[PDB]
Amino acid sequence: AAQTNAPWGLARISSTSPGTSTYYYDESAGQGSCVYVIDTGIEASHPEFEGRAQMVKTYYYSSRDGNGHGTHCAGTVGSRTYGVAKKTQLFGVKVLDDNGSGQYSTIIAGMDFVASDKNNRNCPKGVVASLSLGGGYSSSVNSAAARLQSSGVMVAVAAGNNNADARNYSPASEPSVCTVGASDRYDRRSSFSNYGSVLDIFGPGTDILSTWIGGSTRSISGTSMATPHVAGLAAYLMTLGKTTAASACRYIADTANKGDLSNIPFGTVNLLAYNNYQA
Amino acid sequence: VLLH
Ligand SMILES: [Ca+2]
């Protein structure tokens, strides 16, 4: 299948070179997989989700995304026009308030929740969790991410946007999960992207068009935008049967475009998520 | 603890 005039990031993950505009992908499109977006929530009524999105848990007064961020990330995972895995099932877990902030205890509860909840869902091709959030180092937050991963969920987390070593941030610094840095459309590391030995992979994160609240769209930037590209790619590869939740990050790194990025500090992987699609 |  081919989506013409696709957002640049989708095109990038299906090409060996920058500058293309078509997103090439297998028609299966992540059908049978499930992705939990742990964020400010998801506007499940957005037409772009085609009824494939559902809020399953909130830690606040409402399950509504009054922010937009969560809806944006979810859209990159699996909306019709802006998503990597266009037929996946999306589950929203609201651990961040409408200002986009949240306490570590809530974020941890949200991760433990997903580890259990997945047992009540029909996700024959596998389960993924996308965490476009983080703060200063916390061994407790790292441990929660490690538990989620151990439970059989492919965990993808943002590296962070402080243009610093991700070793000082969580859950980015948990080695067992898939830590995602950001790149721009010219194959440069995004100016704000964290870096470091703990990064596993890069994905498109600068100027990413996706869904927004009020049934709209908008372009924003961040490692928060790169993460759902990788989470969606994982869902897509699991549906194809190429990898499992335990090994998806490694598989993605192994099949990545290698050495194409610029401004990568020594010691940081030069790997860009790639779907290896061949018609 | 964001706005990330
Ligand atoms: Ca890792």
> Which of chain A's residues have a Cβ under 8 Å away from the Cβ of B3?
99-101
Residue spans of the domains in chain A: they are: 1-279
Q: Resolution of the experimental model in angstroms, please?
A: 1.9
Tokens of A257: 């475009």
Minimal C-alpha gap between B1 and chain A (Å)? 4
β-strands A178-183, A201-204: how paired?
parallel
Chain B positions in Cβ-Cβ contact with residue A107 (cut-off 8 Å): 1
- Which phi and psi (to 5°) does residue A8 adopt? -55, -35
Contact A159, A195 (CB under 8 A): yes
Instruction: Say if strands A89-94 and A53-58 run parallel, antiparallel, or are unpaired.
Output: parallel
Angle at A227 between CA A177 and CA A244, to 5 degrees: 50
- Decide if A134 and B2 are in contact by the 8 Å CB cutoff: yes
Nearest residue to A96 via CA among A148, A158, A32? A158
Exactly one of A39, A165, A184, A187 is catalytic; name it: A39
> Minimal Cα distance from A225: which residue of B?
B4
Task: Report residue A99 CA to chain centroid gap.
Answer: 20
- Which token pair is A275? 């779907």
Provide, as residue numbers in chain A, all residues whose Cβ is less than 8 Å from the Cβ of B4.
100, 132-134, 158, 160-161, 222-224
Mutation target vs B (from A67, A133, A169, A225; most B CBs, 10 A cutoff): A133
Cα distances (Å, whole numbers) of residue A158 to A49, A222, B4: 23, 9, 9
Of the candidates A260, A183, A270, A199, which has an alpha carbon nearest to the alpha carbon of residue A16?
A260
Token readout for A55 is 């809020």
Residue A45's CB is within 10 A of a number of other CB atoms, namely 11
Pick among 3.20.190.10, 2.60.40.4070, 3.40.50.200, 3.30.450.20: CATH of A1-279 = 3.40.50.200
CB contact under 8 Å between A100 and B1, yes or no, is: no
- Chain A: nearest CA to B3, how far in angstroms? 5
